[PDB]
Protein backbone atom coordinates (compact mmCIF):
# COMPACT_ATOMS: atom_id res chain seq x y z
CA UNK A 1 0.00 0.00 0.00
CA UNK A 2 3.02 2.21 -0.53
CA UNK A 3 1.96 2.57 -4.16
CA UNK A 4 -1.03 4.69 -3.06
CA UNK A 5 0.21 6.55 0.03
CA UNK A 6 3.14 8.15 -1.83
CA UNK A 7 0.86 9.49 -4.63
CA UNK A 8 -1.24 11.26 -1.98
CA UNK A 9 1.88 12.58 -0.23
CA UNK A 10 2.89 13.91 -3.66
CA UNK A 11 -0.60 15.34 -4.19
CA UNK A 12 0.00 17.43 -1.06
CA UNK A 13 2.67 19.70 -2.67
CA UNK A 14 0.68 19.49 -5.90
CA UNK A 15 -2.01 21.56 -4.21
CA UNK A 16 0.57 23.61 -2.31
CA UNK A 17 2.44 24.67 -5.49
CA UNK A 18 -0.26 25.42 -8.08
CA UNK A 19 -1.50 28.86 -9.08
CA UNK A 20 -4.63 30.46 -7.66
CA UNK A 21 -6.67 29.43 -10.73
CA UNK A 22 -5.22 25.96 -11.40
CA UNK A 23 -5.53 24.18 -8.04
CA UNK A 24 -8.91 22.57 -8.77
CA UNK A 25 -8.08 21.25 -12.25
CA UNK A 26 -4.70 19.77 -11.29
CA UNK A 27 -6.07 18.20 -8.09
CA UNK A 28 -9.08 16.75 -9.95
CA UNK A 29 -6.92 15.32 -12.76
CA UNK A 30 -4.40 13.71 -10.44
CA UNK A 31 -7.01 12.38 -8.00
CA UNK A 32 -8.93 10.84 -10.91
CA UNK A 33 -5.66 9.27 -12.11
CA UNK A 34 -5.13 7.81 -8.63
CA UNK A 35 -8.72 6.54 -8.70
CA UNK A 36 -7.93 4.86 -12.03
CA UNK A 37 -4.83 3.23 -10.54
CA UNK A 38 -6.86 2.17 -7.47
CA UNK A 39 -8.33 -0.83 -9.34
CA UNK A 40 -5.16 -2.93 -8.91
CA UNK A 41 -6.38 -4.04 -5.45
CA UNK A 42 -8.97 -6.33 -7.08
CA UNK A 43 -6.38 -9.14 -7.45
CA UNK A 44 -8.09 -11.12 -4.71
CA UNK A 45 -8.73 -14.78 -3.94
CA UNK A 46 -11.67 -16.68 -2.52
CA UNK A 47 -9.51 -18.11 0.26
CA UNK A 48 -6.54 -15.77 0.86
CA UNK A 49 -5.99 -12.06 1.48
CA UNK A 50 -3.69 -9.91 -0.66
CA UNK A 51 -0.80 -9.09 1.69
CA UNK A 52 1.88 -6.60 0.64
CA UNK A 53 4.05 -6.27 3.77
CA UNK A 54 3.93 -6.57 7.56
CA UNK A 55 1.80 -3.42 7.93
CA UNK A 56 -0.59 -3.41 4.94
CA UNK A 57 -3.01 -6.05 3.67
CA UNK A 58 -6.33 -6.00 1.83
CA UNK A 59 -8.91 -8.77 1.54
CA UNK A 60 -12.18 -8.62 -0.43
CA UNK A 61 -13.79 -6.51 2.35
CA UNK A 62 -11.56 -3.44 2.60
CA UNK A 63 -10.99 -3.24 -1.18
CA UNK A 64 -14.47 -1.88 -2.15
CA UNK A 65 -14.25 0.62 0.71
CA UNK A 66 -10.84 1.81 -0.52
CA UNK A 67 -12.14 2.14 -4.09
CA UNK A 68 -15.17 4.07 -2.81
CA UNK A 69 -12.96 6.40 -0.73
CA UNK A 70 -10.50 7.41 -3.45
CA UNK A 71 -13.34 7.58 -5.95
CA UNK A 72 -15.30 9.86 -3.60
CA UNK A 73 -12.45 12.34 -3.07
CA UNK A 74 -12.49 13.74 -6.67
CA UNK A 75 -16.28 13.98 -6.35
CA UNK A 76 -15.70 15.89 -3.10
CA UNK A 77 -13.38 18.34 -4.87
CA UNK A 78 -16.02 18.90 -7.56
CA UNK A 79 -18.82 19.35 -5.02
CA UNK A 80 -16.94 21.81 -2.79
CA UNK A 81 -15.33 24.07 -5.44
CA UNK A 82 -18.20 26.55 -5.90
CA UNK A 83 -19.28 27.70 -2.43
CA UNK A 84 -15.58 28.29 -1.62
CA UNK A 85 -15.01 30.53 -4.65
CA UNK A 86 -15.16 33.62 -2.40
CA UNK A 87 -12.61 32.27 0.08
CA UNK A 88 -8.97 33.25 0.45
CA UNK A 89 -6.34 31.38 -1.57
CA UNK A 90 -4.60 30.20 1.60
CA UNK A 91 -7.87 28.95 3.10
CA UNK A 92 -8.83 27.25 -0.18
CA UNK A 93 -5.47 25.48 -0.30
CA UNK A 94 -5.90 24.55 3.38
CA UNK A 95 -9.32 23.04 2.58
CA UNK A 96 -7.82 20.95 -0.24
CA UNK A 97 -4.98 20.00 2.12
CA UNK A 98 -7.42 18.77 4.77
CA UNK A 99 -9.33 16.75 2.16
CA UNK A 100 -6.11 15.18 0.83
CA UNK A 101 -4.92 14.42 4.38
CA UNK A 102 -8.30 12.85 5.16
CA UNK A 103 -8.10 10.63 2.07
CA UNK A 104 -4.56 9.58 3.04
CA UNK A 105 -5.75 8.84 6.58
CA UNK A 106 -8.66 6.74 5.31
CA UNK A 107 -6.58 4.70 2.86
CA UNK A 108 -4.02 4.09 5.60
CA UNK A 109 -6.77 3.07 8.05
CA UNK A 110 -8.58 0.62 5.76
CA UNK A 111 -5.44 -1.47 5.10
CA UNK A 112 -4.13 -1.69 8.67
CA UNK A 113 -2.74 -5.18 9.26
CA UNK A 114 -2.71 -4.98 13.07
CA UNK A 115 -5.59 -3.70 15.16
CA UNK A 116 -3.68 -1.12 17.21
CA UNK A 117 -2.57 0.62 14.00
CA UNK A 118 -6.20 0.56 12.87
CA UNK A 119 -7.28 2.10 16.18
CA UNK A 120 -4.77 4.94 16.18
CA UNK A 121 -5.49 5.72 12.52
CA UNK A 122 -9.23 5.46 13.27
CA UNK A 123 -8.92 8.12 15.97
CA UNK A 124 -6.57 10.12 13.72
CA UNK A 125 -9.41 10.43 11.20
CA UNK A 126 -11.13 12.80 13.69
CA UNK A 127 -8.94 15.86 13.07
CA UNK A 128 -9.70 16.99 9.47
CA UNK A 129 -13.44 16.24 9.74
CA UNK A 130 -13.68 18.23 12.98
CA UNK A 131 -11.65 21.09 11.46
CA UNK A 132 -13.86 21.19 8.35
CA UNK A 133 -17.08 21.05 10.40
CA UNK A 134 -16.05 23.76 12.86
CA UNK A 135 -14.44 26.03 10.25
CA UNK A 136 -16.33 25.89 6.95
CA UNK A 137 -19.78 25.11 8.33
CA UNK A 138 -22.58 27.53 7.56
CA UNK A 139 -24.96 27.62 10.53
CA UNK A 140 -24.36 29.23 13.92
CA UNK A 141 -24.38 26.19 16.23
CA UNK A 142 -21.81 24.08 14.33
CA UNK A 143 -19.49 24.17 17.36
CA UNK A 144 -22.00 22.10 19.35
CA UNK A 145 -22.17 19.52 16.55
CA UNK A 146 -18.38 19.32 16.31
CA UNK A 147 -17.99 18.93 20.08
CA UNK A 148 -20.70 16.25 20.16
CA UNK A 149 -19.06 14.32 17.31
CA UNK A 150 -15.56 14.49 18.80
CA UNK A 151 -16.68 13.55 22.30
CA UNK A 152 -18.94 10.69 21.21
CA UNK A 153 -16.07 9.25 19.16
CA UNK A 154 -13.46 9.67 21.91
CA UNK A 155 -15.66 8.38 24.75
CA UNK A 156 -16.45 5.37 22.58
CA UNK A 157 -12.88 4.74 21.47
CA UNK A 158 -10.89 5.05 24.70
CA UNK A 159 -12.31 1.83 26.28
CA UNK A 160 -11.57 0.29 22.87
CA UNK A 161 -7.93 1.33 23.38
CA UNK A 162 -7.87 -0.17 26.88
CA UNK A 163 -9.38 -3.44 25.65
CA UNK A 164 -6.98 -3.65 22.69
CA UNK A 165 -3.90 -3.10 24.86
CA UNK A 166 -5.27 -5.66 27.35
CA UNK A 167 -5.74 -8.21 24.55
CA UNK A 168 -2.23 -7.56 23.21
CA UNK A 169 -0.69 -7.94 26.67
CA UNK A 170 -2.74 -11.09 27.33
CA UNK A 171 -2.23 -13.16 24.19
CA UNK A 172 0.74 -11.54 22.48
CA UNK A 173 -0.14 -9.81 19.21
CA UNK A 174 -2.77 -7.76 17.39
CA UNK A 175 -2.16 -8.85 13.78
CA UNK A 176 -5.41 -9.86 12.11
CA UNK A 177 -3.86 -12.91 10.43
CA UNK A 178 -2.26 -14.07 13.69
CA UNK A 179 -5.52 -13.44 15.56
CA UNK A 180 -7.26 -15.44 12.83
CA UNK A 181 -4.86 -18.29 13.64
CA UNK A 182 -4.45 -17.67 17.40
CA UNK A 183 -8.10 -17.05 18.31
CA UNK A 184 -9.36 -18.21 21.71
CA UNK A 185 -12.95 -18.62 22.91
CA UNK A 186 -14.23 -16.16 25.50
CA UNK A 187 -16.37 -17.72 28.26
CA UNK A 188 -19.55 -16.21 29.70
CA UNK A 189 -17.99 -14.14 32.48
CA UNK A 190 -18.50 -10.55 33.60
CA UNK A 191 -14.90 -9.73 32.70
CA UNK A 192 -15.69 -10.92 29.17
CA UNK A 193 -18.95 -8.93 29.38
CA UNK A 194 -17.04 -5.70 29.94
CA UNK A 195 -14.44 -6.78 27.37
CA UNK A 196 -17.20 -7.16 24.77
CA UNK A 197 -18.68 -3.80 25.76
CA UNK A 198 -15.30 -2.04 25.53
CA UNK A 199 -14.56 -3.66 22.17
CA UNK A 200 -18.00 -2.84 20.73
CA UNK A 201 -19.17 0.55 22.05
CA UNK A 202 -16.78 2.61 19.90
CA UNK A 203 -18.14 1.06 16.70
CA UNK A 204 -21.73 1.29 17.96
CA UNK A 205 -21.03 5.00 18.52
CA UNK A 206 -19.61 5.58 15.05
CA UNK A 207 -22.14 3.42 13.16
CA UNK A 208 -24.24 5.03 15.00
CA UNK A 209 -26.37 2.77 17.18
CA UNK A 210 -29.89 3.99 17.90
CA UNK A 211 -29.83 5.81 21.21
CA UNK A 212 -26.28 7.01 20.54
CA UNK A 213 -27.10 8.41 17.08
CA UNK A 214 -27.68 11.98 18.29
CA UNK A 215 -24.39 13.21 16.82
CA UNK A 216 -25.70 12.51 13.30
CA UNK A 217 -28.75 14.86 12.91
CA UNK A 218 -26.55 17.85 13.86
CA UNK A 219 -23.15 17.12 12.28
CA UNK A 220 -24.77 16.07 8.99
CA UNK A 221 -26.70 19.34 8.69
CA UNK A 222 -24.49 22.30 9.61
CA UNK A 223 -21.38 20.81 7.98
CA UNK A 224 -20.48 21.70 4.37
CA UNK A 225 -21.02 19.29 1.48
CA UNK A 226 -17.59 17.64 1.65
CA UNK A 227 -17.80 17.14 5.41
CA UNK A 228 -21.34 15.79 5.03
CA UNK A 229 -20.16 13.29 2.41
CA UNK A 230 -17.17 12.14 4.47
CA UNK A 231 -19.43 11.75 7.51
CA UNK A 232 -22.18 9.89 5.64
CA UNK A 233 -20.32 7.65 3.19
CA UNK A 234 -17.01 6.65 4.82
CA UNK A 235 -16.74 6.93 8.61
CA UNK A 236 -19.84 4.86 9.39
CA UNK A 237 -18.39 2.18 7.14
CA UNK A 238 -15.07 2.64 8.97
CA UNK A 239 -16.86 1.74 12.19
CA UNK A 240 -18.56 -1.17 10.44
CA UNK A 241 -15.24 -2.49 9.14
CA UNK A 242 -13.80 -2.20 12.64
CA UNK A 243 -16.75 -4.09 14.11
CA UNK A 244 -16.40 -6.78 11.43
CA UNK A 245 -12.72 -7.20 12.33
CA UNK A 246 -13.35 -7.19 16.09
CA UNK A 247 -16.32 -9.59 16.23
CA UNK A 248 -14.09 -12.52 15.23
CA UNK A 249 -12.32 -12.16 18.60
CA UNK A 250 -15.47 -12.27 20.76
CA UNK A 251 -17.01 -15.70 20.27
CA UNK A 252 -19.16 -17.34 21.63
CA UNK A 253 -20.25 -14.68 24.13
CA UNK A 254 -21.95 -12.56 21.43
CA UNK A 255 -24.49 -15.33 20.79
CA UNK A 256 -26.01 -14.49 24.19
CA UNK A 257 -24.65 -10.92 24.42
CA UNK A 258 -26.00 -9.18 21.31
CA UNK A 259 -29.67 -9.70 22.27
CA UNK A 260 -30.36 -6.07 23.44
CA UNK A 261 -28.13 -4.23 20.96
CA UNK A 262 -29.59 -5.97 17.89
CA UNK A 263 -33.06 -5.27 19.16
CA UNK A 264 -32.00 -1.73 20.09
CA UNK A 265 -31.73 -1.43 16.32
CA UNK A 266 -34.62 -3.79 15.50
CA UNK A 267 -37.12 -1.30 16.93
CA UNK A 268 -35.11 1.90 16.51
CA UNK A 269 -34.84 1.75 12.72
CA UNK A 270 -38.64 1.75 12.75
CA UNK A 271 -39.24 4.94 14.70
CA UNK A 272 -36.28 6.89 13.30
CA UNK A 273 -37.72 6.11 9.88
CA UNK A 274 -41.01 7.49 11.23
CA UNK A 275 -39.06 10.66 12.07
CA UNK A 276 -38.43 11.01 8.33
CA UNK A 277 -42.22 11.09 7.95
CA UNK A 278 -42.32 14.34 9.98
CA UNK A 279 -39.12 16.21 9.11
CA UNK A 280 -39.01 19.81 7.88
CA UNK A 281 -35.28 19.71 7.06
CA UNK A 282 -34.19 17.67 4.03
CA UNK A 283 -30.63 17.06 5.24
CA UNK A 284 -31.97 15.72 8.54
CA UNK A 285 -34.18 13.36 6.52
CA UNK A 286 -31.13 12.08 4.63
CA UNK A 287 -29.23 11.68 7.91
CA UNK A 288 -32.06 9.66 9.46
CA UNK A 289 -32.21 7.48 6.34
CA UNK A 290 -28.49 6.85 6.91
CA UNK A 291 -29.31 6.01 10.54
CA UNK A 292 -31.85 3.39 9.42
CA UNK A 293 -29.44 1.81 6.91
CA UNK A 294 -26.66 1.67 9.51
CA UNK A 295 -29.07 0.06 11.99
CA UNK A 296 -29.72 -2.64 9.37
CA UNK A 297 -25.94 -3.00 9.05
CA UNK A 298 -25.69 -3.33 12.85
CA UNK A 299 -28.24 -6.17 12.88
CA UNK A 300 -26.53 -7.96 9.98
CA UNK A 301 -23.04 -7.77 11.51
CA UNK A 302 -24.18 -8.66 15.02
CA UNK A 303 -26.08 -11.81 14.03
CA UNK A 304 -22.78 -13.00 12.40
CA UNK A 305 -24.15 -15.15 9.61
CA UNK A 306 -22.45 -15.23 6.16
CA UNK A 307 -25.41 -13.95 4.10
CA UNK A 308 -25.75 -11.17 6.67
CA UNK A 309 -22.11 -10.22 6.05
CA UNK A 310 -22.64 -10.09 2.28
CA UNK A 311 -25.79 -8.02 2.69
CA UNK A 312 -23.98 -5.74 5.14
CA UNK A 313 -21.11 -4.88 2.79
CA UNK A 314 -23.37 -4.54 -0.27
CA UNK A 315 -25.75 -2.23 1.61
CA UNK A 316 -22.72 -0.33 2.95
CA UNK A 317 -21.41 0.48 -0.53
CA UNK A 318 -24.83 1.19 -2.05
CA UNK A 319 -25.99 3.35 0.86
CA UNK A 320 -22.72 5.29 0.87
CA UNK A 321 -23.07 6.16 -2.81
CA UNK A 322 -26.80 6.93 -2.49
CA UNK A 323 -26.36 9.11 0.61
CA UNK A 324 -23.51 11.02 -1.04
CA UNK A 325 -25.73 11.66 -4.08
CA UNK A 326 -28.64 12.75 -1.87
CA UNK A 327 -26.39 15.11 0.11
CA UNK A 328 -25.15 16.61 -3.17
CA UNK A 329 -28.77 17.08 -4.27
CA UNK A 330 -29.62 18.79 -0.97
CA UNK A 331 -26.55 21.03 -1.30
CA UNK A 332 -27.48 22.04 -4.87
CA UNK A 333 -31.07 22.88 -3.91
CA UNK A 334 -29.84 24.80 -0.84
CA UNK A 335 -27.44 26.75 -3.06
CA UNK A 336 -30.26 27.62 -5.44
CA UNK A 337 -32.91 28.61 -2.86
CA UNK A 338 -30.71 29.71 0.13
CA UNK A 339 -32.81 27.71 2.61
CA UNK A 340 -32.85 24.16 3.93
CA UNK A 341 -36.64 24.16 4.42
CA UNK A 342 -38.18 21.33 2.41
CA UNK A 343 -41.65 22.91 2.16
CA UNK A 344 -40.29 26.12 0.61
CA UNK A 345 -39.06 25.06 -2.84
CA UNK A 346 -41.86 23.25 -4.67
CA UNK A 347 -42.55 22.25 -8.26
CA UNK A 348 -38.91 22.00 -9.33
CA UNK A 349 -39.74 19.57 -12.16
CA UNK A 350 -41.38 22.34 -14.21
CA UNK A 351 -38.16 24.39 -13.95
CA UNK A 352 -35.43 21.71 -13.67
CA UNK A 353 -36.23 18.57 -15.70
CA UNK A 354 -32.78 16.95 -15.59
CA UNK A 355 -32.46 17.62 -11.86
CA UNK A 356 -35.91 16.06 -11.43
CA UNK A 357 -34.66 12.98 -13.30
CA UNK A 358 -31.64 12.78 -11.00
CA UNK A 359 -33.96 13.19 -7.99
CA UNK A 360 -36.12 10.33 -9.28
CA UNK A 361 -33.10 8.06 -9.82
CA UNK A 362 -31.65 8.84 -6.38
CA UNK A 363 -35.00 8.26 -4.65
CA UNK A 364 -35.49 4.98 -6.55
CA UNK A 365 -32.03 3.78 -5.53
CA UNK A 366 -32.80 4.80 -1.94
CA UNK A 367 -35.95 2.64 -1.71
CA UNK A 368 -33.99 -0.48 -2.84
CA UNK A 369 -35.26 -0.87 -6.39
CA UNK A 370 -33.99 -4.13 -7.93
CA UNK A 371 -31.57 -5.01 -9.38
CA UNK A 372 -29.54 -2.29 -7.68
CA UNK A 373 -26.93 -3.05 -5.02
CA UNK A 374 -29.09 -1.70 -2.17
CA UNK A 375 -31.85 -4.22 -2.89
CA UNK A 376 -29.27 -7.04 -3.03
CA UNK A 377 -27.77 -6.08 0.32
CA UNK A 378 -31.05 -5.47 2.11
CA UNK A 379 -32.53 -8.68 0.66
CA UNK A 380 -29.54 -10.72 1.85
CA UNK A 381 -29.90 -9.14 5.31
CA UNK A 382 -33.62 -10.03 5.36
CA UNK A 383 -32.87 -13.65 4.36
CA UNK A 384 -30.21 -13.93 7.06
CA UNK A 385 -32.40 -12.42 9.78
CA UNK A 386 -35.32 -14.63 8.77
CA UNK A 387 -32.93 -17.55 9.19
CA UNK A 388 -32.20 -16.14 12.65
CA UNK A 389 -35.87 -15.91 13.67
CA UNK A 390 -39.28 -15.76 12.03
CA UNK A 391 -41.23 -12.81 13.51
CA UNK A 392 -38.42 -10.34 12.71
CA UNK A 393 -39.68 -10.30 9.10
CA UNK A 394 -42.44 -8.02 10.42
CA UNK A 395 -39.80 -5.75 11.94
CA UNK A 396 -38.23 -5.54 8.50
CA UNK A 397 -41.39 -5.64 6.41
CA UNK A 398 -43.03 -2.58 7.95
CA UNK A 399 -39.75 -0.74 7.31
CA UNK A 400 -40.23 -1.71 3.65
CA UNK A 401 -43.29 0.52 3.78
CA UNK A 402 -41.96 3.47 5.75
CA UNK A 403 -38.76 3.93 3.72
CA UNK A 404 -40.85 4.34 0.57
CA UNK A 405 -43.32 6.42 2.58
CA UNK A 406 -40.65 9.02 3.13
CA UNK A 407 -38.39 8.70 0.09
CA UNK A 408 -41.04 9.23 -2.57
CA UNK A 409 -42.43 11.83 -0.16
CA UNK A 410 -39.06 13.56 -0.43
CA UNK A 411 -39.50 13.13 -4.18
CA UNK A 412 -42.99 14.66 -4.14
CA UNK A 413 -42.78 17.86 -2.09
CA UNK A 414 -39.54 19.08 -3.66
CA UNK A 415 -40.58 18.26 -7.23
CA UNK A 416 -44.33 17.80 -7.69
CA UNK A 417 -47.01 20.46 -7.28
CA UNK A 418 -47.52 24.10 -8.14
CA UNK A 419 -44.23 25.99 -8.09
CA UNK A 420 -43.51 28.75 -5.59
CA UNK A 421 -44.35 32.25 -6.80
CA UNK A 422 -41.81 34.48 -5.05
CA UNK A 423 -38.83 32.22 -5.86
CA UNK A 424 -37.48 33.44 -9.20
CA UNK A 425 -33.72 32.78 -8.95
CA UNK A 426 -33.81 29.12 -10.04
CA UNK A 427 -30.96 29.08 -12.54
CA UNK A 428 -30.61 26.29 -15.13
CA UNK A 429 -28.59 23.23 -14.22
CA UNK A 430 -24.84 23.74 -13.95
CA UNK A 431 -22.67 21.32 -15.91
CA UNK A 432 -20.60 20.76 -12.76
CA UNK A 433 -23.64 19.53 -10.81
CA UNK A 434 -24.81 17.24 -13.62
CA UNK A 435 -21.29 15.82 -14.01
CA UNK A 436 -21.04 15.20 -10.26
CA UNK A 437 -24.41 13.44 -10.07
CA UNK A 438 -23.69 11.29 -13.13
CA UNK A 439 -20.34 10.34 -11.56
CA UNK A 440 -22.30 9.41 -8.43
CA UNK A 441 -24.99 7.41 -10.22
CA UNK A 442 -23.40 5.62 -13.20
CA UNK A 443 -20.92 3.51 -11.12
CA UNK A 444 -23.88 2.16 -9.12
CA UNK A 445 -25.80 1.15 -12.25
CA UNK A 446 -22.62 -0.36 -13.70
CA UNK A 447 -21.90 -2.34 -10.52
CA UNK A 448 -25.48 -3.61 -10.68
CA UNK A 449 -24.29 -5.77 -13.59
CA UNK A 450 -21.30 -7.29 -11.73
CA UNK A 451 -21.86 -7.18 -7.95
CA UNK A 452 -19.59 -10.17 -7.22
CA UNK A 453 -16.66 -7.89 -6.31
CA UNK A 454 -18.55 -6.08 -3.52
CA UNK A 455 -20.20 -9.03 -1.76
CA UNK A 456 -17.64 -9.44 1.03
CA UNK A 457 -14.55 -11.47 1.92
CA UNK A 458 -16.27 -14.88 2.00
CA UNK A 459 -17.96 -14.98 -1.41
Amino acid sequence: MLKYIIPTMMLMPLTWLSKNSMIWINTTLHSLLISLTSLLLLNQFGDNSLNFSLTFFSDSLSTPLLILTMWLLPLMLMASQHHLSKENLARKKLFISMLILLQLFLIMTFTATELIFFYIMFEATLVPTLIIITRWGNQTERLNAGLYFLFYTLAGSLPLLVALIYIQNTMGSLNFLILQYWVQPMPNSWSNTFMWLACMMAFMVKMPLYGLHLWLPKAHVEAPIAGSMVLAAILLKLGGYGMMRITLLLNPITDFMAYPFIMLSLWGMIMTSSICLRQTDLKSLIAYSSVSHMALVIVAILIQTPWSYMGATALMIAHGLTSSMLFCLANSNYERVHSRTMILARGLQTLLPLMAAWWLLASLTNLALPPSINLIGELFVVMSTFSWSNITIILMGLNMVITALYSLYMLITTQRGKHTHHINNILPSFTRENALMSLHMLPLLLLSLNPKIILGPLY
Binding site: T350, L352, P353, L354, P428, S429, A435
Partner: protein, 70 residues
Protein backbone atom coordinates in the same frame (compact mmCIF):
# COMPACT_ATOMS: atom_id res chain seq x y z
CA UNK B 1 -53.47 28.70 -36.88
CA UNK B 2 -52.95 31.17 -34.02
CA UNK B 3 -49.58 29.90 -32.85
CA UNK B 4 -48.81 30.78 -29.22
CA UNK B 5 -45.31 30.77 -27.74
CA UNK B 6 -45.09 27.89 -25.27
CA UNK B 7 -43.32 29.32 -22.22
CA UNK B 8 -40.70 26.78 -21.19
CA UNK B 9 -37.46 26.67 -19.18
CA UNK B 10 -34.19 26.94 -21.08
CA UNK B 11 -33.43 23.57 -22.67
CA UNK B 12 -29.99 24.38 -24.08
CA UNK B 13 -27.92 23.49 -21.01
CA UNK B 14 -29.23 19.98 -20.30
CA UNK B 15 -29.12 19.08 -24.00
CA UNK B 16 -25.52 20.32 -24.24
CA UNK B 17 -24.57 18.32 -21.13
CA UNK B 18 -26.18 15.15 -22.50
CA UNK B 19 -24.58 15.65 -25.92
CA UNK B 20 -21.08 16.16 -24.55
CA UNK B 21 -21.49 13.29 -22.07
CA UNK B 22 -22.50 10.96 -24.92
CA UNK B 23 -19.62 12.25 -27.07
CA UNK B 24 -16.99 11.78 -24.36
CA UNK B 25 -18.34 8.33 -23.47
CA UNK B 26 -18.40 7.15 -27.09
CA UNK B 27 -15.01 8.63 -28.06
CA UNK B 28 -13.37 5.96 -25.90
CA UNK B 29 -16.16 3.36 -25.95
CA UNK B 30 -15.93 2.82 -29.72
CA UNK B 31 -12.13 2.15 -29.87
CA UNK B 32 -12.16 -0.16 -26.84
CA UNK B 33 -15.07 -2.21 -28.22
CA UNK B 34 -13.36 -2.32 -31.64
CA UNK B 35 -10.22 -3.61 -29.93
CA UNK B 36 -12.26 -6.13 -27.93
CA UNK B 37 -14.04 -7.52 -31.00
CA UNK B 38 -10.76 -7.64 -32.94
CA UNK B 39 -9.19 -9.56 -30.06
CA UNK B 40 -12.18 -11.93 -30.05
CA UNK B 41 -12.22 -12.43 -33.82
CA UNK B 42 -8.56 -12.30 -34.88
CA UNK B 43 -6.51 -13.18 -31.78
CA UNK B 44 -9.27 -15.41 -30.42
CA UNK B 45 -9.88 -17.30 -27.21
CA UNK B 46 -7.72 -19.98 -25.61
CA UNK B 47 -8.13 -23.76 -25.68
CA UNK B 48 -8.19 -26.14 -22.72
CA UNK B 49 -5.38 -28.69 -22.62
CA UNK B 50 -3.93 -30.99 -19.98
CA UNK B 51 -0.62 -30.08 -18.35
CA UNK B 52 2.36 -31.81 -20.01
CA UNK B 53 4.97 -33.54 -17.90
CA UNK B 54 7.94 -31.30 -17.12
CA UNK B 55 6.27 -27.95 -17.85
CA UNK B 56 5.57 -25.31 -15.20
CA UNK B 57 3.49 -22.55 -16.82
CA UNK B 58 3.39 -18.95 -15.70
CA UNK B 59 0.37 -17.71 -13.76
CA UNK B 60 -1.17 -15.81 -16.69
CA UNK B 61 -1.20 -19.07 -18.68
CA UNK B 62 -3.88 -20.37 -16.28
CA UNK B 63 -6.52 -18.04 -17.78
CA UNK B 64 -8.53 -18.06 -21.00
CA UNK B 65 -9.27 -14.59 -22.38
CA UNK B 66 -6.31 -12.67 -23.88
CA UNK B 67 -7.28 -9.50 -22.01
CA UNK B 68 -7.36 -11.49 -18.76
CA UNK B 69 -3.98 -13.03 -19.62
CA UNK B 70 -2.55 -9.57 -20.32
Amino acid sequence: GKRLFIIKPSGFYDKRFLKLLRFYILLTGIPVVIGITLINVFIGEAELAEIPEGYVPEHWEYFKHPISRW
